[PDB]
Design a protein around this ligand. Structure first.
Ligand SMILES: CCc1cccc(CC)c1NC(=O)c1nn(C)c2c1CCc1cnc(Nc3ccc(C(=O)NC4CCN(C)CC4)cc3OC(F)(F)F)nc1-2
Ligand SMILES: CCc1cccc(CC)c1NC(=O)c1nn(C)c2c1CCc1cnc(Nc3ccc(C(=O)NC4CCN(C)CC4)cc3OC(F)(F)F)nc1-2
Lengths: 253, 253
């Protein structure tokens, strides 16, 4: 049974949750026996470039705290030349797991989730920030409310990748794609391109105009519409977040 | 226990070997109780486009028979609107398996293999044909001699993929890359980019000039050279097959 000093105050590890290479996340117990999460990041091989990226991300998250409830809380942090410790709220589970483990989505519970994600992405969008790497993992479930976990600034599938990031061999429109895949999965039970096995076959698909993303008729046609509008390959055509906030799917019934 | 009619002559399945979706390969027993392989291809969903590709490939293989011993033998074929049956030699195993199962390569057994592959690729190269999708699978081991299995004309990793096929969002030089990865694996025990986990991280690597493919010093410096020359990102720089046939690694000691 071991501990961590963050800004001179102490927490006892209870168990490790996340691993991400040069980083670990622990559920911990603070002084007043309350429970928290600590993200830990090793800066041994950190080169100034890599380094500032982290500095930037901290600054922003820390800053964007009092802008949206749908971003994870950051309670305190320590930062030195070798490491960062961040003290964030501890949640129940992340969206991706809940997905893996879950095999039924109350159509109503799906809607709220989407609602949360949009608020979040919007916020970071209203600040020059574009995440560009969104996957169910980047969200956290905390009493049926989702939070965004990171801003995609610092530092394994191609699935949620948009056509345009591929034609790249940067737009807010790129986050809509992803966002919609995450909806798509939630809806047709899986991502739009899981079918395709061959990892290069999937790259071509993601970019070829003549491939039809399949859109199975379903009760909710709002929802059907949305996904159709989020997955429009041309970005200039793709719906925008301000539009998506004002679509029926979120607005009416 | 079941059979197959190919050009009116009959073979009894003994066991299924390959599966490839709309295709199966069987080890079979002919009349005179000799053993063969039959590739079977279903043409139900075949569209004229897809269709001719198959027609083309058959024609070529069939044709390129009496040009090189290092291409699989094709004994006879039947072709109709619904299917193809091809009767080819049956081998002992394919290179990829022998690789998976094998964990030691007589440096000498490696050399012969390379030698075989080159002869083969060269042949198909001397006919406008560029395979463009080479992986240990496309070869077959038949009494320690390798054969090429198909020509990459008809019809799941990114590993053996060359920079240039990626910047594509067609040159003989593209087959050298692949060919060299297959050598690389054989040599440093794995492909040049397996390290990289993230499937998009690997795409960037495969194309970024500043990433060093790592080249561990070893006894054979010929071999070391070769791989260094095969994996040159700029195609115009990359060595050519006629050069590779005339390199020490194949020529001297
Ligand atoms: C190095 C980490 C990292 C790097 C880059 C980017 C990101 C996120 C975008 C992150 N990743 C992170 O920064 C990160 N990863 N996790 C998991 C958390 C964070 C931040 C805060 C945070 C707050 N609360 C939690 N709660 C929990 C989330 C998931 C589980 C869990 O059950 N995991 C299981 C793992 C095995 N599978 C099969 C089933 C689920 C348990 C949890 O704590 C609880 F115990 F209290 F519930 N997690 C986190
Ligand atoms: C649909 C097929 C297809 C489509 C596109 C492209 C291509 C090749 C480029 C092909 N694929 C093919 O066209 C194709 N695939 N195989 C396997 C053969 C061919 C063509 C002729 C051919 C002739 N002889 C063999 N021999 C054998 C090759 C491998 C095994 C074997 O042991 N497989 C195991 C599978 C499980 N793993 C774990 C261990 C190895 C057994 C074999 O026959 C023997 F029994 F007599 F030894 N194979 C083939």
């Amino acid at each position: 049974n071991e501990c961590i000093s963050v800004k001179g105050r102490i927490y006892s590890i209870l168990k490790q949750i996340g691993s991400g290479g040069s980083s670990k996340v622990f559920q911990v117990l603070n002084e007043k026996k309350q429970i928290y999460a600590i993200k830990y990041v090793n800066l041994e091989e950190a080169d100034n470039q890599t380094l500032d990226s982290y500095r930037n991300e901290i600054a922003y998250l820390n800053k964007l705290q009092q802008h949206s409830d749908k971003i994870i809380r950051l309670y305190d942090y320590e930062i030195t030349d070798q490491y960062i410790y961040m003290v964030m709220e501890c949640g129940n589970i992340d969206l991706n797991s809940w997905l893996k483990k879950k095999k039924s989505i109350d159509p109503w519970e799906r809607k709220s989730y989407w609602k949360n994600m949009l608020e979040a992405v919007h916020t970071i969008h209203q600040h020059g920030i574009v995440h560009s790497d969104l996957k169910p993992a980047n969200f956290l479930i905390v009493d049926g409310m989702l939070k965004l976990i990171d801003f995609g600034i610092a530092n394994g599938t191609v699935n949620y990748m948009p056509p345009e990031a591929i034609k790249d061999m940067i737009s807010p429109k790129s986050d809509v794609w992803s966002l919609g895949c995450i909806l798509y999965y939630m809806t047709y039970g899986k991502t739009p391109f899981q079918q395709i096995i061959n990892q290069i076959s999937k790259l071509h698909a993601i970019i070829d105009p003549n491939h039809e993303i399949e859109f199975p008729d379903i009760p909710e046609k709002d929802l059907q519409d949305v996904l159709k509008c989020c997955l429009k390959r041309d970005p200039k055509q793709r719906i925008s977040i301000p539009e998506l906030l004002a679509h029926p799917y979120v607005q009416i019934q």
